[PDB]
Design a protein around this nucleic acid. Structure first.
Ligand SMILES: [Mg+2]
Ligand SMILES: [Mg+2]
Ligand SMILES: [Mg+2]
Ligand SMILES: [Mg+2]
Ligand SMILES: [Mg+2]
Ligand SMILES: [Mg+2]
Ligand SMILES: [Mg+2]
Ligand SMILES: [Mg+2]
Ligand SMILES: [Mg+2]
Ligand SMILES: [Mg+2]
Ligand SMILES: [Mg+2]
Ligand SMILES: [Mg+2]
Ligand SMILES: [Mg+2]
Ligand SMILES: [Mg+2]
Ligand SMILES: [Mg+2]
Ligand SMILES: [Mg+2]
Ligand SMILES: [Mg+2]
Ligand SMILES: [Mg+2]
Ligand SMILES: [Mg+2]
Ligand SMILES: [Mg+2]
Ligand SMILES: [Mg+2]
Ligand SMILES: [Mg+2]
Ligand SMILES: [Mg+2]
Ligand SMILES: [Mg+2]
Ligand SMILES: [Mg+2]
Lengths: 233, 68, 121, 252, 56
RNA sequence: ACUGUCUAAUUAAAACAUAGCAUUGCGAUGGUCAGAAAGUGAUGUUGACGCAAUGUGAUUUCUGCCCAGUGCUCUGAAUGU
RNA sequence: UUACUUAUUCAAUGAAGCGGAGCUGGAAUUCAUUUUCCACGUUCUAGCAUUCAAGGUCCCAUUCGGGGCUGAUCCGGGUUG
């Protein structure tokens, strides 16, 4: 009020140098950024075959979190827990004369790609988890079809790295369960039901549907409003 | 194991699933430098039977050459 | 939440952390001793007749001096070896490929005296 | 035989442009926010002679909308523009000699110079002293504009393509005889090394298709096909007619 | 010569009026009168189109 | 026509050039030209009062007839190759 | 044959304001209410236009300094053709 004044500015083309604004939409990115974005786009623009694109249909965050919840009880031995187990059965077995068992039959999530494949082939898998990222996609893509044929209930899940954490690796392509402690059997059957309902049942129909063929929005609104006026005046 | 499946799939080049893959990948490569380091094999079964190993000291490079 | 706010359209190489070298083993294993010392800087006196004259009439000492040495290195070395104050130092390259220093002392010192103290005449 | 003269020019040794004194490329302002929505004002700070050019340049300064500073442009000067004059450039801008407007925004019969081929190229057509182009019509659906270039040709370009009102200055330059070798000499001295010209018919065979013979003469038809190959094309290339042109020129 | 201007005192490089070592007096005279009259007519320009909006 | 230019070391000329005159190609996704190739290059800091390609040779005067041939060219033809 | 754009191609720019919607106006005539289409800070003058903007507002615990929001409407990150 007192000696203070209201100036204000005219930003109106031909006066008053423009204020600093957010140009983030316009910044010129490094090529490696430019590509990983354009790669994402090109995959959406193209028509994508049903044997791929049966991915992108991914387990919902709820059913998944319940699935991780169960799986996380089954983690493999930590480095310490094996060193620990050994000294137990290094002593007790070699002396107390139990034959190679001072240790209980372990129950753990099964992993590694070649490991899991032969498990599915051998019908030993109760549940197979498949990641959605897996850049050389071929390592994985045959798995739903393999599972479907072997009558092994499977799910496509987000987090190749989140599958990793539960096995104590940076990443894992797959995670599977074969054995389960009798205490957890019913929770599993419940998970298997919801999962089979979202994947193994829908397999045949999904197999018929191509994906992609999706426009960007500048192209979208152009044809949304062009087909809008042309037909209905 | 998985490698056997990769082998057979890769023998269908004109199959719709590989035609897609071929088309997307060939664009990406052509965007990068004519010689550029590859993080991992994109044919793990092929590398494998040519003597590749996942231990430290093995390296993959990707490269472009003109045709004709 | 939402994205970063950049007000500029140029993306620049992120300013990242540069670590100083911490060698696991020494470079050359012994440091080289001083490559130009006062004894290697000033080589011989120059006793030519016309040089001896600068000593008598000019209060000036003429030395053959290392080709690798500058006016600073010459001044200091004459100062340390001969216990004398230097006024100024002029130099030139002889045409046999050697360097000649014309070294004038300060008014306090007598070049002639200092010349037959070092022992030439 | 030898590589003839018109083959040696492409290697650009002694044939490159003599560029040292030139004021710098003449261009329109970059096509930006101001110019495609509003207009923007400038002052011609000077109008100046460019070396090896027929027509004067005009230095025109503007304010930088995004930063505090002045930004100076080099225009080809239209006849009648003057120092101190205000120049207006943009979609919405009054129609006056010296201003730059999109071809769509001016009525037929409008006369403009330094007109862009595509929008944004900062001008292509009608830059030589005396020249202009005329707007002969509009097609508002697909927003094109039909113009007639100095050659007589009629081309159709984007109505967004910019041009500048008026004609280029220094016209009539070619009406005055050069009168002597020296005037030509100093002329090409500031252009490139094209002068003088030896006639192929005064050369030996090694040198040129026309070379040789105990009398000077071409010896075969001097009309050469497009299909001809380098070292063959000299004389009248792809001529659809030849001989003194009788009767009115001026395409219908 | 340009570098000698660094060896001389500031009074040799200026005159006491605004825009002293830069513009030519009579030029400064002009940009005063011009500034003033334009800043005035700028008021005249607003209130006239302030009424034009109100009566139309 | 003039002033000008060349065969250093047998030709300085009527030869070459020149202004003037005329013809030809091209609106840039181009004309002419360079390169083994290229995200290459000359014209081009260019735009037809321009660049590129030929001829004739200042002024005055005048440049007739012939498109069958060889070229060049074409909003042409079509049931032959 | 003619549409599409992501391959490929061309131009531009220290990848700055693109596309879609909304505010206020208004031409417009209402056949129930808006069915729409344009707009939507700069043109007597060879001045001046920069310190994340003054203003307004909310904070830090009132220091001197300093921050947030608004001023400058939302939404999609397709740099513009
Ligand atoms: Mg590695
Ligand atoms: Mg010296
Ligand atoms: Mg050059
Ligand atoms: Mg020459
Ligand atoms: Mg000639
Ligand atoms: Mg000639
Ligand atoms: Mg001859
Ligand atoms: Mg020949
Ligand atoms: Mg021939
Ligand atoms: Mg001949
Ligand atoms: Mg002849
Ligand atoms: Mg003074
Ligand atoms: Mg002051
Ligand atoms: Mg003579
Ligand atoms: Mg001779
Ligand atoms: Mg002579
Ligand atoms: Mg002679
Ligand atoms: Mg004549
Ligand atoms: Mg290339
Ligand atoms: Mg002659
Ligand atoms: Mg001529
Ligand atoms: Mg007659
Ligand atoms: Mg007759
Ligand atoms: Mg004939
Ligand atoms: Mg841009």
């Amino acid at each position: 009020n007192p000696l203070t004044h209201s100036t204000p500015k005219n930003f109106g083309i031909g006066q008053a140098v423009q204020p600093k604004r957010n140009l983030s939409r316009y910044v010129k990115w490094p090529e490696y950024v430019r590509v990983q974005r354009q790669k994402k786009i090109l995959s959406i623009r193209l028509k994508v075959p049903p044997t791929i694109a049966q991915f992108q249909y991914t387990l919902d965050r709820n059913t998944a979190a319940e699935t991780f919840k169960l799986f996380n009880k089954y983690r493999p031995e930590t480095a310490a827990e094996k060193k620990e187990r050994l000294t137990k059965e290094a002593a007790a077995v070699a002396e107390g004369k139990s034959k190679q068992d001072a240790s209980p039959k372990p129950y753990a999530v099964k992993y590694g790609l070649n490991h899991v494949v032969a498990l599915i082939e051998n019908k030993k898998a109760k549940l197979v988890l498949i990641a959605n990222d897996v850049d050389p996609i071929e390592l994985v893509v045959f798995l739903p079809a393999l599972c479907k044929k072997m009558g092994v209930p499977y799910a496509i899940v987000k987090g190749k790295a989140r599958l990793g954490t539960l096995v104590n690796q940076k990443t894992s392509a797959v995670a599977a369960l074969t054995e389960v402690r009798a205490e957890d059997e019913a929770a599993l059957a419940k998970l298997v039901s919801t999962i089979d309902a979202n994947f193994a049942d829908k397999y045949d129909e999904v197999k018929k549907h191509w994906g992609g063929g999706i426009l960007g929005n500048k192209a979208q609104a152009k044809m949304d409003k062009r087909a809008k006026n042309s037909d209905s005046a | 194991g998985a490698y056997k499946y990769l082998e057979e799939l890769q023998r269908k080049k004109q199959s719709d699933v590989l035609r897609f893959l071929q088309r997307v990948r060939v664009w990406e490569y052509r965007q990068k430098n004519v010689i550029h380091r590859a993080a991992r094999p994109t044919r793990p079964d092929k590398a494998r039977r040519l003597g590749y190993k996942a231990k430290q000291g093995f390296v993959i490079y990707r490269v472009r050459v003109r045709r004709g | 939440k939402a994205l970063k706010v950049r007000t500029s359209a140029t993306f620049r190489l992120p300013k990242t952390l540069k670590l100083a070298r911490a060698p696991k083993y020494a470079s050359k294993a012994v440091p080289h001793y001083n490559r130009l010392d006062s004894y290697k800087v000033i080589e011989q006196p120059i006793t030519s007749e016309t040089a001896m004259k600068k000593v008598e009439d000019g209060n000036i000492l003429v030395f053959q001096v290392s080709m690798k040495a500058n006016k600073y290195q010459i001044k200091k070395a004459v100062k340390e070896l001969y216990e004398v104050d230097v006024l100024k130092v002029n130099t030139l390259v002889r045409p046999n490929g050697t360097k000649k220093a014309y070294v004038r002392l300060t008014a306090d010192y007598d070049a002639l005296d200092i010349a037959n103290r070092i022992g030439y005449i | 035989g030898r590589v003839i003269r018109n083959q040696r020019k492409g290697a650009g040794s002694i044939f490159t442009s003599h560029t040292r004194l030139r004021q710098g490329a003449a261009k329109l302002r970059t096509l930006d926010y101001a110019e495609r929505h509003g207009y923007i004002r400038g002052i011609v700070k000077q109008i100046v002679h460019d070396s090896g050019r027929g027509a004067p340049l005009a230095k025109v300064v503007f304010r930088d909308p995004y930063k505090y500073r002045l930004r100076e442009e080099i225009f080809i000067a239209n006849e009648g523009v003057h120092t101190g004059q205000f120049i207006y450039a943009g979609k919405k801008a009054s129609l006056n000699v010296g201003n730059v407007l999109p071809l769509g925004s001016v009525p037929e019969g409008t006369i403009v110079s330094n007109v862009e081929e595509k929008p944004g190229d900062r001008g292509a057509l009608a830059r030589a002293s005396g020249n202009y182009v005329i707007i002969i019509g509009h097609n508002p659906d697909e927003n094109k504009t039909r113009v007639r270039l100095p050659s007589g040709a009629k081309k159709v370009i984007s109505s967004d393509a910019r041009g500048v009102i008026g004609v280029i200055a220094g016209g009539g330059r070619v009406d005055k005889p050069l009168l002597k070798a020296g005037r030509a000499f100093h002329k090409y001295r500031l252009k490139r090394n094209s002068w003088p010209k030896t006639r192929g018919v005064a050369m030996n065979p090694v040198d040129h298709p026309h070379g040789g013979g105990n009398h000077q003469h071409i010896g075969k038809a001097s009309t050469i096909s497009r299909g001809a190959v380098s070292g063959q094309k000299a004389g009248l290339i792809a001529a659809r007619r030849t001989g003194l042109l009788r009767g009115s020129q001026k395409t219908q | 010569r340009p570098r000698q201007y660094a060896t001389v005192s500031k009074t040799h490089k200026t005159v006491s009026r605004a825009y002293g070592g830069s513009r030519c007096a009579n030029c400064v005279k002009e940009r005063i009168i011009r500034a003033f009259l334009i800043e005035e007519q700028k008021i005249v320009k607003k209130v006239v189109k302030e009424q034009t909006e109100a009566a139309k």
